[PDB]
Amino acid sequence: TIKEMPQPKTFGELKNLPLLNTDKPVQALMKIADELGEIFKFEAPGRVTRYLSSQRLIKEACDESRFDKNLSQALKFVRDFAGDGLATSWTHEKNWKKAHNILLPSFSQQAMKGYHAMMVDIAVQLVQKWERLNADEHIEVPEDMTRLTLDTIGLCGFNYRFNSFYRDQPHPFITSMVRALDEAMNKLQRANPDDPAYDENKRQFQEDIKVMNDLVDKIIADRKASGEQSDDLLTHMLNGKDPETGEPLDDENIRYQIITFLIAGHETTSGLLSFALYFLVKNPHVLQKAAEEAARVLVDPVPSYKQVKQLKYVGMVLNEALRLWPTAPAFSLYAKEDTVLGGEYPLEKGDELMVLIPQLHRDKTIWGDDVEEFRPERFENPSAIPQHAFKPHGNGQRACIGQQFALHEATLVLGMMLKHFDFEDHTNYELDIKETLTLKPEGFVVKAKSKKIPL
C-alpha cells in the first residue's frame, strides 16, 4: 500500500540542491521526472518537497479542501520586492482575499472590453514595426513580444507608456525589475548565500528594490494628487473597497500589486506568444488554419473586442502552446491536514508539493501517444479533457487572476500577426529555452513577409 517514492542523486549535506545549480533547472527537473516517474522527493538544507508530474496525483493536489497554495523558495525571494501582492501572499494573509475581492472585477471578461482599445494601441505599434523592417532583416521574437506585453500592462494597467518599441535599452524601472528577478532566481541555487562572493549581488539587490519602490510610490502619489479618473488598475485600486472587510488597499500594498502586475506582464504572456509563433512556423498547416481564421474574422483595419472573441482557433493554438511549454512552469502547495495522496503516499500537515506543469502536460495517459505533437484540436471539447490535466494558470482560488487579460491580449496580437504577415523560419531555429521567472525561447528569430494589408 504505502509506497516509498524515488529521489534523485544527492550531494552529502547539500542533499539534492546542487541539481538546481544550472541555468535551466525546470528542464533539469523534467528530465529527472522522465527517469523517476510521477512523483519524486527533493531535499535541500532545511527543505523537503515532492515533485508531481502525473494527472493521477495532481488532480488530488488540486483539491482545495486538502491543499492550499505554498510559497516556493522562488516566490519567497520574489516577495522581497513583490511584498504581499496577490502572487506572493499566503491565502490566509488579510491582504490576499482583500486585494482579490477588490481586483477581481478589474480582470473579468467584461473588463476586457475597456482594455481592448489600449491593447490595440500597442499591438498596432508591433505590426507597424514589422511592416517597417527592411527586406532580409529579421524579427527577434521574444524581444519584441516582451516589448509588447510590458507596454500593454503599463498602458492598460496604469496609463503609463514604457515606449518599448522606441528603445533598445529598457526603461530604468525595468532594468531593476529584470535584475531583481535574476537575483531572486539565482539565489535559489547558492549552497551558501552568506559567502562574501554574494556581497555585491546583495548590495545591487537592495538598490533595485529601492528604484522599484521609489518609482511606483511616485506614480501612486502623482495619480492621487491628480484626480484623473482613468479606467485603469491604479484607479480601481485607489477607489475600490473590499465588500468583506469594507477596507480599501493601502498605498504600500497598491505598490506591491503594481510591481506584481508588471512582473506578470513582462514575463508570462510574452513567453506564450513567443512559443505560439515558434510552434506555428514549425507546423505550417496549423499556421494556415489559424491565418485563415484571422483573415475571415479580422475584417476591419483595427480588431474589435467582439472579433477577438471569435478567434476561436487562435485560442486553441494558444492553449496548445501553453500545454507543451507553460511559461510559468510550476506552482507549490502544502497539505492543510494529514492526507494520503493517490492511496500510496501519506503526507503530514504542512508537507509541500511542487506541480511540474510541463511534465503534467506530457502525461501520455491523458493526451495519448502524439503528446509531443502540436495539435490545437486537442482543445475542441474541454469536457473530453479529464479534470486538472491542464494547469497553465494554476489552480482554484489562487489561479492566475490575469488569465482573461493574457488570453485577450495574446489572441488579439497573434490574430493581427497572422492577418498581416507570412512568417518564415529562415534559420531553421533549434528551440532553446531560457529560464528566468518563466520560460521563453531564446534566440528565436523569423522573417515576416507583409501581406500589405493596411491598418
Query: Of 260, 258, 265, which Cα lies nearest the Cα of 238?
Result: 258
Q: Given the complex with ligand D0L, which of 74 and 281 has the nearer CB atom?
A: 74
Angle at 154 between CA 152 and CA 157, to 5 degrees: 90
- 321, 359, 352, 331: which is closest to 56 by C-alpha? 359
- Min CB(20)–ligand D0L separation in Å: 6
340 φ, ψ to 5°? -115, 125
Q: Are 68 and 89 in contact (CB under 8 A)?
A: no
Of 39, 49, 143, 205, the one binding ligand D0L (CB under 6 A) is 49
Q: Quick one: what does residue 263 bind among ligand D0L, ligand HEM, ligand C=Cc1ccccc1, none, with the CB cut-off 5 to 8 Å set by partner type? A: ligand C=Cc1ccccc1
**52-66 burial by CB neighbour count: b if 16+ within 10 A, else e?**
bbbbbbbbbbbeeeb
User: 57 is written with which cell numbers?
Assistant: 496525483
Provide the minimum distance between the beta carbon of 264 and ligand C=Cc1ccccc1 in the complex, in angstroms, as a whole number. Answer: 4
Distance CA 214, CA 305 (A): 36
Which 79-118 positions form the footprint of ligand D0L (CB under 6 A)? none
Where in 388-447 is the site for ligand D0L (CB under 6 A)?
A: 437-438
User: In the complex, what is the shortest distance from the CB of residue 78 to ligand C=Cc1ccccc1, in angstroms, rounded to a whole number?
Assistant: 5
**Shortest CB 424 distance to ligand HEM, Å:** 26
Query: How many residues sit close enough to ligand D0L to count as binding (CB under 6 A)?
Result: 17
Confirm or deny that 400 is annotated as ligand binding: yes
Q: Is 98 in a helix, a strand, or coil?
A: helix
Containing H/E element for 81? helix 73-82
Q: Can residue 178 be called a binding residue for ligand D0L (CB under 6 A)?
A: no
Cβ atoms of 314 and 418 closer than 8 Å: yes
Q: Which chain residues interact with ligand C=Cc1ccccc1 by CB under 6 A?
A: 78, 82, 87-88, 260, 263-264, 328
318-357: contacts with ligand D0L (CB under 6 A): 328, 330, 354
Ordered DSSP codes for 208-227:
HHHHHHHHHHHHHHHHHTT-
Identity of the residue, 260 or 283, whose beta carbon is nearer to ligand D0L in the bound complex: 260
Q: How far is the CB of 201 from ligand C=Cc1ccccc1 (least distance, A)?
A: 19
Beta bridge partners of 52: 39, 355
Q: How far is the CB of 16 from ligand C=Cc1ccccc1 (least distance, A)?
A: 23
- Residues forming contacts to ligand D0L in the complex (CB under 6 A) are 20, 25-26, 29, 42, 44, 47, 49, 72-74, 188, 328, 330, 354, 437-438
Q: Annotated binding site for (9Z)-hexadecenoate: which residue ranges? A: 51
Q: Annotated binding site: which residue ranges? A: 51, 400
